[PDB]
Amino acid sequence: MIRSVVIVGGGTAGWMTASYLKAAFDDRIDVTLVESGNVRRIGVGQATFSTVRHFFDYLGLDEREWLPRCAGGYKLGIRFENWSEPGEYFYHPFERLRVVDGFNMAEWWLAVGTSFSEACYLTHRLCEAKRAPRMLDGSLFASEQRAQFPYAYHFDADEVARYLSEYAIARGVRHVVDDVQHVGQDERGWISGVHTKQHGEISGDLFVDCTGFRGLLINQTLGGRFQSFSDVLPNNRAVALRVPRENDEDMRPYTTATAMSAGWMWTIPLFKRDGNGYVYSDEFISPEEAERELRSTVAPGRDDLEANHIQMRIGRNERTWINNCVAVGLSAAFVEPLESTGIFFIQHAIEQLVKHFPGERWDPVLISAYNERMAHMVDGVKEFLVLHYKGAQREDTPYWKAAKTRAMPDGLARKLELSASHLLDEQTIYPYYHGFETYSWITMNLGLGIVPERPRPALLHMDPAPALAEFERLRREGDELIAALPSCYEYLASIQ
Amino acid sequence: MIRSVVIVGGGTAGWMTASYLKAAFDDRIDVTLVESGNVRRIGVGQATFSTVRHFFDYLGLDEREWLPRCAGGYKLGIRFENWSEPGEYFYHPFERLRVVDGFNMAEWWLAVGTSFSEACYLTHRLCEAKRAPRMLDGSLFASEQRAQFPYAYHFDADEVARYLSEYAIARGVRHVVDDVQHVGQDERGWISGVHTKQHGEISGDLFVDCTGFRGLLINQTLGGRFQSFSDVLPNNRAVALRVPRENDEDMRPYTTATAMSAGWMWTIPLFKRDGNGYVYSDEFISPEEAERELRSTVAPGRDDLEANHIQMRIGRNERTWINNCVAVGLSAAFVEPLESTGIFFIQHAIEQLVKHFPGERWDPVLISAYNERMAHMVDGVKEFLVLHYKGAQREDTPYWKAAKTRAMPDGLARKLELSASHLLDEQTIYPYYHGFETYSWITMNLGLGIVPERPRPALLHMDPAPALAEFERLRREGDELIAALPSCYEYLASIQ
Numbered sequence A, B: 001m002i003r004s005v006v007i008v009g010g011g012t013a014g015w016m017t018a019s020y021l022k023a024a025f026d027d028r029i030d031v032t033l034v035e036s037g038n039v040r041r042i043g044v045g046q047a048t049f050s051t052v053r054h055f056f057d058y059l060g061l062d063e064r065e066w067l068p069r070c071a072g073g074y075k076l077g078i079r080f081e082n083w084s085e086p087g088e089y090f091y092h093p094f095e096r097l098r099v100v101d102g103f104n105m106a107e108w109w110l111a112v113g114t115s116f117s118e119a120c121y122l123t124h125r126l127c128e129a130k131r132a133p134r135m136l137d138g139s140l141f142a143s144e145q146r147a148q149f150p151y152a153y154h155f156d157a158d159e160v161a162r163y164l165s166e167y168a169i170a171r172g173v174r175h176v177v178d179d180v181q182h183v184g185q186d187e188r189g190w191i192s193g194v195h196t197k198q199h200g201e202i203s204g205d206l207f208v209d210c211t212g213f214r215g216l217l218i219n220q221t222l223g224g225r226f227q228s229f230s231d232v233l234p235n236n237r238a239v240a241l242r243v244p245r246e247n248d249e250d251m252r253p254y255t256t257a258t259a260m261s262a263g264w265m266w267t268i269p270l271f272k273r274d275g276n277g278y279v280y281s282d283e284f285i286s287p288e289e290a291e292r293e294l295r296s297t298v299a300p301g302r303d304d305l306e307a308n309h310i311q312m313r314i315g316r317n318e319r320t321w322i323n324n325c326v327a328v329g330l331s332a333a334f335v336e337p338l339e340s341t342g343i344f345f346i347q348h349a350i351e352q353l354v355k356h357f358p359g360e361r362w363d364p365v366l367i368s369a370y371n372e373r374m375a376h377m378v379d380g381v382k383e384f385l386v387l388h389y390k391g392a393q394r395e396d397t398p399y400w401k402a403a404k405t406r407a408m409p410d411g412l413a414r415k416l417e418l419s420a421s422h423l424l425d426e427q428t429i430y431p432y433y434h435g436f437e438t439y440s441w442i443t444m445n446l447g448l449g450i451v452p453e454r455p456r457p458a459l460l461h462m463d464p465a466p467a468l469a470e471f472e473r474l475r476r477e478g479d480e481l482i483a484a485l486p487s488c489y490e491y492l493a494s495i496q
Ligand SMILES: Cc1cc2nc3c(=O)[nH]c(=O)nc-3n(C[C@H](O)[C@H](O)[C@H](O)COP(=O)(O)OP(=O)(O)OC[C@H]3O[C@@H](n4cnc5c(N)ncnc54)[C@H](O)[C@@H]3O)c2cc1C
Pocket: A008, A009, A010, A011, A012, A013, A014, A034, A035, A036, A037, A038, A039, A040, A041, A042, A043, A044, A045, A046, A047, A048, A049, A157, A178, A179, A180, A181, A210, A211, A212, A213, A214, A216, A238, A277, A310, A312, A328, A329, A330, A331, A337, A340, A341, A342, A343, A344, A346
């Protein structure tokens, strides 16, 4: 049995790890977190993925408890705007496709169909009407049933870290505010301790590197190799603004991803404000040009509002677990937030760290299994993201022209051939766990315009009546839900 | 739209296809089946896999209806006997493992455990007590709930074909009893029709090859390449006996697979009798030697009983769909019946044929996707079967010594390495659909003796109480079920 964990870094990565370890092992693990008082954590508004409910449940926290304390909002999906036809948008919702007579509604839609997402998903209407996913009495709109409509959240990154540090400290995590200046290694290259400015050497059995892009332990100390995705995903910078929303009722229960001239822009609706960020490649636009284009789009003349500029390290470490060090968060990997995966990567890395937790005999076969899982998680998402750029039909600036001809990860060419003939499915998407399911791959293809040439031929041999009835049910149930549900803001105000 | 299907062959493959097509498309497809009046279909007692319930449900047939008409029995799993030492055994049941605090009962069994199957599965007790999976009132023991304990069947192959021909003919399948003498091809190599002795040319749009090992269309006409698995799975012959049952209550609700001196032997319990078959490699034992060994084991002195000798073609076509011809059943592929997969391959080929049904354009991308799916289906099983021979600890004859050192498929080595350290899971088993789930891979490993060196270290850091309570629940629920359920025979007698 290993006795102690030392976490270096106090961002979302560090505190999620601390909290989860305590929830998992309680007093059967000792945990110390060391974080700098002067190197700032990434603090923007952030979107999450559908698995995030599980993390809070596991911690024993109800959404009514944590969400208001993190300036929280609801994410039913992502609205993708201006990617193909100008002014055309669509939704990528957290909602599974229904199945009629062995075929999902997307197959039926192609045969007997109004946009795809509007026809096939309740969530589409909920978004258009800016509904909350809960009735005022707190009950889920589905009436677990949470899996069928697995909505996620928007929140303030600083606040969630602040809230989790409190959770973790309340449960025995030793907290040290100091800078790590040197990382000690023993005669085998294993980490022996971290040397701080004012608290001496801090030691333990297992070191978790949550130091962000920097990768102080995994890269700077251990020589872990970082594999860049720039060749297939060139976006490398971001500029963000925090914009107050004059209207409450304008609060949208979804993230928006708007294609810009040389990248794309997020809109993440928090409780009293919207975060906006322009993710771009500095090969096609300067940071200054990018700030100007962002400002023009969301806050013209608002020079009172400060712009936050960030460089991104895009890609992943070959191995996120080397010797007795595991990297969690941006130290481990990162891709642009086009599908809100940052916190997903953190949660999964942590869940899997618990599953692959080391005993006193560090098992290299177990560690290698952990490393494969982490590689597949990010590689699957990388491939899914490249699909977004390949699906985008717009070709109006040098950036979009270059996205059209840019090299692809292995396997994506095949998925694009398949997609021109028929829909991807469980057997033909990326086969290893990467968060996303079949409906996500299909929805992006259909929304962006990668559409089968013709419907599935089997369908012509079948009775269309049950599918047509299902489409009618969906439109009907939609109508009813938007009449019964409070607005996104309404519900949130009622739980503050 | 294509209109007409011509099936050549009236074994299980042919009639399953005919029936399923009618159930799927009704009068929106024309189907003709041509079968020889003098080449016999494979007629032994057969075991099935868990998906088979879906096939009968799809046809609209309740088990009370079809099972008695096929001399049917229940299969709750497979009892593996003597794969290591004489008198030792374990079950591979159709039952999913329960999960406690994020870990399945197998992981808990290694940490806090009585054999593995006995500890972890209700089905173990049901098999030992020879229970039926249903109460006399017809209700499932689980109280869908059918997925949690997805039992299958034993039946007579001739009877099921006979029963399905009736189903299909009742629904408009044209039936022709004749020999196909020549298969015609157009200028492009596409099949134009099949020439019979007494009924002239029979034509259609789509040709299904259900001619068995022979592959009259797919191999003899089209020149499809057949990929042999003999290098990794040498068994190439079988000899079978049909043995009447003295005492009805000897009827077991499972298949038995007993390792023999140069292969293994099945016991398949039908309603009035047991089928027994010795599957073997003629490199290590002659067909005469094999018959003697079989006779000695299950029916000594019973020379009234006729032995049925069969050569097996083991492997798969590179492509089961070429031009306008799709191979279904033994014409497509076959592996030894160690895990009862023949009918499973038929059903999945058919289900996927409906999904990939061609339109007038014959989309080559769609066909290619079908071929990949069929290749994976069989390759996954092939790898699982080699695992059985690699896990077998016995080394007492040249056959078993040779099984120990025989070459493996790519990918298995890595799975064996993982297995010595920790349990396989969804990410580390064969990744494409091949019928079997994680619990099957794990259960075979633990049953055969491929056991992690030590329990999962994470477990030592956790409270064992909930798992211990679950084990107790399982033992308790087991006790109750064998007291409440009728015998396998009892229930079957009550529905004849
Ligand atoms: C522009 C942008 C947008 C994003 N949007 C989303 C989104 O919408 N949704 C989502 O899920 N994710 C998003 N992400 C990812 C998200 O920011 C991270 O996943 C998450 O906040 C965790 O970051 P981190 O904890 O790994 O690193 P950081 O927040 O950078 O924390 C690093 C920590 O290490 C400490 N540290 C560094 N060096 C030392 C040292 N020498 N001694 C002691 N301490 C040290 C620092 O003090 C700090 O506490 C986005 C990222 C970027 C860059």
